[PDB]
């Protein structure tokens, strides 16, 4: 029911890795299914910095922007 | 092992076709047969040839 | 100094080998 | 108890009375740490005792030791052994040490040796090089 220890961060499940991106390819676009909070069933694609696996739970400070170029 | 070069696959096909009945879908028997049957003075190339003959035996049983 | 040619530059006194460090590469074997 | 003496004058120097005796005597311009430890062990004073709490007679003994270490230590422990003018073994403290050091360089200069000419030119007198580090961004002579 509650996952995120913080208050301003919702949780997000890594369901699918989309692919690398960004200058030098240090960003990875990833399918994140929203956990607890508004848009509780939404599925986004987000840019995550650092190594990521399937099943990783990340903290979302915001859940509006999809926003993936990093040209 | 990433990719088998030309001489590996060539020796593989010639030993598999000269003696089609002395190879099945196991690696140990394949290694024994290739050591018995070919002048293979290198353990690594012998092992690669045995594995590649194993894969041909797999695909030849799969095709039928 | 050396053995096959007197050079004196890279004298070499390892063990008992007297060579100029360039003669040795040609005669090494 | 007895309040520590903040300033203790031994051998014409206001040594700190809050520091240990051996590490306070080293502030004198002829006494180092080795010489101070030797003086303390020879005179029976604890080298790690507070100088400001020492007694007055021990202070006089320490002052006399700094002034006349050549009576106590061996010849090989003194900063002027086999004296180049008098021939005696001496340990010079402060101003007499500085004058003794100065009057060797002056003798080199008024003979115009290689070392004397280097001292006149203000360059390094021991075998070194000047296409290099060379020129000091500091002060060479500190004695």
């Amino acid at each position: 029911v509650k996952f995120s220890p913080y208050e301003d961060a919702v949780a997000g499940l890594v369901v699918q890795i989309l692919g690398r991106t960004g200058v030098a390819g240090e960003v990875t676009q990833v399918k994140i299914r929203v956990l607890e909070g508004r848009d509780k069933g939404r599925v986004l694609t987000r840019n995550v910095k650092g190594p990521v696996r399937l099943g990783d739970i990340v903290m979302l400070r915001e859940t509006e922007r999809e926003a993936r170029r990093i040209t | 092992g990433r990719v088998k070069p030309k001489f590996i696959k060539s020796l593989a096909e010639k030993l598999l076709e000269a003696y089609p009945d002395r190879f099945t879908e196991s690696f140990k028997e394949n290694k024994k047969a290739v050591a018995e049957l070919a002048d293979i003075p290198s353990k690594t190339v012998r092992n690669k040839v045995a594995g590649y003959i194993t894969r041909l035996v797999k695909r030849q049983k799969a095709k039928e | 100094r050396c053995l096959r040619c007197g050079t004196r530059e890279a004298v070499i006194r390892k063990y008992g080998l007297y060579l100029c460090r360039r003669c040795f590469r040609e005669v090494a074997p | 108890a007895q309040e520590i003496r903040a300033i203790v004058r031994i051998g014409d120097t206001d040594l700190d009375g809050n520091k240990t005796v051996a590490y306070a005597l080293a502030k004198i311009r002829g006494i180092g740490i080795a010489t101070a430890y030797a003086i303390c062990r020879k005179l029976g004073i604890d080298p790690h005792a507070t100088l400001g709490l020492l007694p007055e007679d021990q202070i006089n003994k320490l002052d006399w030791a700094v002034r006349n270490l050549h009576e106590l230590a061996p010849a090989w422990f003194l900063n002027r052994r086999k004296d180049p003018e008098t021939g005696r073994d001496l340990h010079l403290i402060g101003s007499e040490l500085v004058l003794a050091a100065k009057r060797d360089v002056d003798l080199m200069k008024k003979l115009k040796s290689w070392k004397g000419i280097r001292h006149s030119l203000g360059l390094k007198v021991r075998g070194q090089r000047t296409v290099t580090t060379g020129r000091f961004g500091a002060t060479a002579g500190v004695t």
Partner: protein, 68 residues
């Protein structure tokens, strides 16, 4: 005047202050009372030899004493 380098009026103050703490260090004592850490070491070790403190964590430099 235990520890001749330190005044008794400061030593008794450190003695009463240390029992109010949960864990004390010679650095903390030196910072709180404006004294050298080497003097804070002897100040804490005198209380440990008294029995007011128990050493619970040693190391080069820093020591940890618990009041009991």
């Amino acid at each position: 005047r235990t520890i001749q380098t330190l005044d008794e009026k400061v030593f008794q103050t450190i003695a009463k202050e240390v029992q109010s703490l949960k864990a004390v260090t010679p650095y903390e004592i030196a910072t709180k009372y404006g004294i050298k850490m080497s003097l804070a070491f002897k100040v804490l070790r005198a209380l440990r030899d008294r029995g007011d403190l128990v050493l619970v964590a040693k190391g080069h430099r820093t020591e940890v004493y618990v009041p009991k």
